[PDB]
Specification:
The structure is a homohexamer. By secondary structure, chain A is mostly beta strands. Chain A is built from 1 helix and 7 strands. The complex binds zinc ion (6 copies).
Chain lengths: 143, 143, 143, 143, 143, 143
């Protein structure tokens, strides 16, 4: 790991439903990993970066309205202009019975439930790199 | 404090702009504190709860597109059916120059910048309380 | 009251649901009061202003998809740079049975149902104040 | 006119921009007229109705982020199952200079600026009509 | 027809619901026809244009979450500054039973189901017309 | 290829901006490929399916507000419960100068510009497969 792990955390609201049955789409996780990756790039080189692509996105558990979700990312390798990052998505709380809209019961997921993993790469053109911006990234070094 | 502090963390995207000039509205913070409060209520008594009101919301710094934000909340007092909570909002990263849309430079806020505080109260009817759901809340006790 | 009361009015659509059960979050009301406050500031001094904070937000009735809502605000006191405003939220129509998604019946709320109240304050820096912009605000005077 | 005029009122936020240059699309007005029409149908016959179509939508002035807008509608004719309604859209306040994102100046539109008109028709199947729900509609009568 | 028919195609997600019962509003179709019209104007004269109005919008079948929809438009007449266009909306796939949120069954609409038609007009000021931009529009000629 | 290619087509509006500078996030493409994949699954086996993951997402050109985009997908292999699909994203029109918000000029991309590719897999549990629903998929066969 280069630098600290970045952790986003938020709730799936009714606005996050995508399919019928209060089911959130897997792309919602990818949206959040894009923002996690951006934060990592701000810290390592002071630019919001451009997202190049992914490998091995795996969606491992369904996500519903009322789930509380965490999205973890970290830099695995600092390249010359490209940065290889790893990502995870975890469910930390949920409604007890999504099928009953009037049921207000909810609980924690302890341990948390793995909902996705991915490897991604981000790019900052050499002329736009500004060096580390956040103290945990100070010994980021390039090849 | 009763139980653990809950920390939401996410990015302000262009979708979070509300006013002209890429300025986010203060209500965006209140939206997030509602979800923080919900998470606390899930953990303390197993219900999503109803939000009763606030006191002393203070908005202390402007928030823009490209800001990375954290939203902290915790339970201060467990009542019979009402729960008094404290909330904070903190900026952890930002664009360098929001006034130049083509400027991709961004940096950390170290130390983080205080953007808001509030006291709020949430309600779970007695019949809907289920006891603690998350281990850090196990010694929640009522009057 | 200084100037006229501003009244926003609109419908809660399915897009306004936040929690399960077609329940709208209280923060939706705060979002609308921010826009009511902005309109008041445009009229009193010709600037969109910055929202400083609230006191005594109280949420008094639940709001659902298909509710028609009014949001009232007015200036109580013109300060030097700060303006104290009062806000209310009222339900004027609703679905008869939110628990049956196929039920299309709806009715008025006559009398209207109080859903929230608040006191808030908004700020316009002295250099940005332009004087009244709307005829009902012409005798706005500062201390 | 049958019954009272319904008036929606709200702000165009940055979220309402559609085209480049902070320009709102004309369809945003049609969205709001759909909700105005729904409210009229709730009042005249107690059902949210189905929107059948329009004639003569005319868009008469551009709408931008930061405009405050009113949307008026009323019933012109109560049919057997169809209801002919008239609609208008009016601008009541606006930013002074949309082309300068840092300019916070705004003013009223006094008199208000006409932004659109339309004639539309809505439908409630005979079996779903429940009679008037709001006192101003009490003498709604059908052919 | 002047030039080619433009065809938009997409899915109604849960985010497109507007009324209760997973029902999409007719204005969603008008939103899409605005974007179809824009594309036609880009191709015929190189400007995003301004939408002037409609005649004869007819909404002919309800649209729900999980419907796959196509939106067709074409130029019927090139005027001096105004362009008369025709529009259609077609349903190509749908959920089998919208009333059961846990039912994941879906099917095609073969033949496709007509959901709307309209005639609209768009405007490009003479000074902003740039001539055809897309090869199928090369023989666009004005009066 | 098994069955026909599915083509989604739509516009990036101001609502699709994500980063500063009117830049759309790469996750917007992944959102659309999820809906393309869903449509393919409806046609091949009559269920909306669950998205399993991706390989080799590559983002190849930036996307901005005012771009018109096409999203292509097709089934490469029908498995027992998993379906391997290929996806592409293409830009077909764009604003001439995104950096000038008042510039309304736009043009076609002829030839269209490649913005992304991916391989993905979708899942329908055996008990939920219903056979082909759309005539071009009639000779879908499983191992
Ligand atoms: Zn570096
Ligand atoms: Zn308890
Ligand atoms: Zn003044
Ligand atoms: Zn009647
Ligand atoms: Zn021409
Ligand atoms: Zn099959």
């Amino acid at each position: 790991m280069v630098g600290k792990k970045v952790v986003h955390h938020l709730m799936m609201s009714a606005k996050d439903a995508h399919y019928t049955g209060n089911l959130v789409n897997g792309a919602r996780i990818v949206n959040q990993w894009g923002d996690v990756g951006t934060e990592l790039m701000v810290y390592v080189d002071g630019d919001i970066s451009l997202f190049l692509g992914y490998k091995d996105i795996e969606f491992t558990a369904p996500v519903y309205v009322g789930d509380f979700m965490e999205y973890h990312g970290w830099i695995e390798k600092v390249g010359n202009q490209s940065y290889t990052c790893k990502f995870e998505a975890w469910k930390v709380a949920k409604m007890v019975d999504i099928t009953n809209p009037q049921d207000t019961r909810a609980t924690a997921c302890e341990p948390p439930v793995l909902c996705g993993t991915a490897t991604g790469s981000l790019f900052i053109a050499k002329d736009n790199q500004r060096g580390p911006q956040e103290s945990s990234f100070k010994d980021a070094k390039h090849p």
